[PDB]
């Protein structure tokens, strides 16, 4: 969609939002943030993962990751590493103070072992079936990928087809019989359109 | 920065890529060869060493060709290697006088020449030098075949060479169709210049003409995938029967 500037600074607010536009106007040119390069296969933190904070005020505490920002190697843990800010402030009302999480680098959190709730290092390994999963280094235990709600806000289980939603049986029905005819030719036969005039040859150059 | 190859080598690199790669080897070697033209507007020394009159010492001497300008109209005639001389002169042959621009133009004549191999007469614009070269070669047909490309200095002359070479290569019967004895006599006269027909077709062609000729030879309609897939299907079925 939006073609971001070459050195756009990603933040907590998603790009293209109202807050982001005010913080990052089209004419802004700030110093780039040096981000350690991590490959997609090397990345091992996902939404819903339980990690332990290593540095900060909440060192040693465990929480659930609610958002991951790959452009900054950021993980957001709900209710941890939080500072307090006023929200909904007006001229007459001072506002409401709420805890606000601060982003944490991937090196500032450590994934926890499901068997023993302690931080541990993990490596990407393939199982017998061939699936790629995360394996704890010290214990050799498979850490399943957490089940996080889909980004489109649609639950397949709690889904009811609407008046304009094709049913599964009709959608998956195979009515295509392969043939050496174009779409135009098949429609002419289907609708009974008859054309006897022949197309004259033309010069292409 | 710097180029990987020198600029003057860019033309030769292009001959190793693209359609020029697929040109015949014998034709490409002809372009690469650059022989020194026979001196026409300058007198060669004739010796590699000469004793300098002043110091009485043996000094190496070299022949530096005079630059020659060939007008485009020269390509429709046979000037015998002559051309316009674009140069400077000193007034009254005194180096202390003015340096003036001088152009020397050959005296052009219109003459009619008959080619025994081609059995045709051509009205070709020639100079007095061209007549002497033909006289020394004992005929126009000998002159065209004997004279190298760098000495002909005429696209028409090279085109005449290709026509004669093709007839000799093919033993073309269109030369006097009703006189088989006379046709064989002329071919026997010029049998020393006979070359294979494959090489004769590329004689005298420019780079652009050769590329166009090569493109036409390689120009063919793509084979429909229906025919290709039929061949694979038929072959695979036969192999299946053998295993059974």
């Amino acid at each position: 969609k939006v073609t971001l500037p070459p050195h756009y600074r990603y933040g907590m607010s998603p790009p293209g939002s109202v807050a982001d536009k005010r913080k990052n106007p089209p004419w802004i040119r700030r110093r780039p943030v040096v981000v350690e390069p991590i490959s997609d296969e090397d990345w091992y933190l996902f939404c819903g993962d339980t990690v332990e904070i290593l540095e900060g005020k909440d060192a040693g505490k465990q929480g659930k990751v609610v958002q991951v920002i790959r452009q900054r190697n950021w993980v957001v843990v709900g209710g941890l590493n939080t500072h307090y800010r006023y929200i909904g402030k007006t001229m007459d009302y001072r506002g409401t103070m709420i805890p606000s999480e601060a982003p944490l680098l991937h090196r500032q959190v450590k994934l926890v072992d499901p068997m023993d709730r302690k931080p541990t290092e993990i490596e990407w390994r393939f199982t017998e079936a061939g699936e790629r999963v995360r394996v704890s280094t010290r214990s050799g235990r498979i850490i399943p990928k957490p089940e996080f709600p889909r980004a489109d806000g649609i639950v397949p289980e709690t889904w009811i087809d609407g008046p304009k939603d094709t049913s599964v049986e009709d959608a998956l029905e195979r009515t295509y019989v392969p043939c050496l005819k174009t779409l135009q030719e098949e429609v002419m036969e289907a609708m009974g359109i008859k054309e006897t005039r022949k197309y004259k040859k033309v010069y292409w150059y | 920065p710097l180029h990987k190859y020198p600029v003057w080598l860019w033309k030769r690199l292009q001959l190793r890529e693209g359609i020029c790669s697929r040109l015949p080897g014998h034709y490409l070697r002809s372009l690469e060869e650059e022989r020194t033209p026979t001196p026409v507007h300058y007198r060669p020394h004739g010796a590699k060493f000469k004793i300098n009159p002043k110091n009485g010492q043996r000094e190496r001497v070299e022949d530096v060709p005079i630059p020659i300008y060939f007008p485009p109209e020269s390509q429709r005639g046979l000037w015998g290697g002559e051309g316009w001389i674009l140069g400077q002169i000193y007034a009254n042959n005194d180096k202390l006088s003015k340096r003036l621009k001088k152009v020397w133009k050959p005296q052009l004549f219109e003459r009619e020449f008959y080619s025994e191999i081609l059995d045709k007469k051509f009205t070709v614009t020639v100079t007095m030098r061209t007549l002497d070269l033909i006289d020394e070669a004992y005929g126009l047909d000998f002159y065209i075949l004997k004279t190298p490309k760098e000495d002909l200095c005429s696209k028409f002359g090279m085109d005449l060479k290709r026509g004669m070479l093709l007839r000799l290569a093919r033993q073309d019967p269109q030369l006097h169709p009703e006189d088989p004895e006379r046709r064989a006599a002329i071919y026997d006269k010029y049998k020393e210049f006979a070359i294979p027909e494959e090489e004769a077709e590329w004689v005298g062609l420019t780079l652009e003409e050769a590329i166009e000729k090569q493109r036409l030879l390689e120009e063919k309609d793509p084979v429909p995938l229906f025919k290709i897939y039929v061949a694979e299907l038929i072959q695979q079925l036969q192999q299946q029967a053998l295993s059974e």
Partner: protein
């Protein structure tokens, strides 16, 4: 003083310039003497709209649909699904010759066809 950067459209220039420039719409006829326009019926495109009565396909698909791998259609797949069964049936029977390739659906020349694959002479 003229704006070189602005797009050159039919709204700029004298009366002759404005009437000659168009907006990309295709012509549907020609002008005869007296500036009379003759509209050719065949040059006007015809919208081939099918009957949608009793149609079970809707603009959207229910999310309870199993995910399927994407396999783009190629010439090899089309040949196998459409032509291979016809050739294999005749091969076993022993009646197969290159002369009858037109029986299996091969078209040696696109000339004489209402819809020519190359050069294309039909709209989308």
């Amino acid at each position: 003083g003229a704006d070189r950067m602005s797009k050159w459209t039919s709204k700029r220039g004298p009366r002759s310039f404005r009437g000659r420039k168009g907006r990309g719409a295709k012509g549907i006829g020609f002008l005869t003497s007296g500036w009379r326009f003759v509209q050719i019926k065949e040059m006007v495109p015809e919208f081939v709209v099918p009957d949608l009565t009793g149609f079970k396909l809707k603009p959207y698909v229910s999310y309870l649909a199993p995910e399927s791998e994407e396999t783009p259609l190629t010439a090899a797949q089309l040949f196998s699904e459409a032509v291979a069964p016809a050739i294999e049936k005749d091969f076993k029977d022993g009646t197969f010759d290159p002369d009858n390739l037109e029986k299996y659906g091969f078209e040696p020349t696109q000339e004489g066809k209402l819809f020519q694959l190359y050069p294309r002479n039909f709209l989308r």
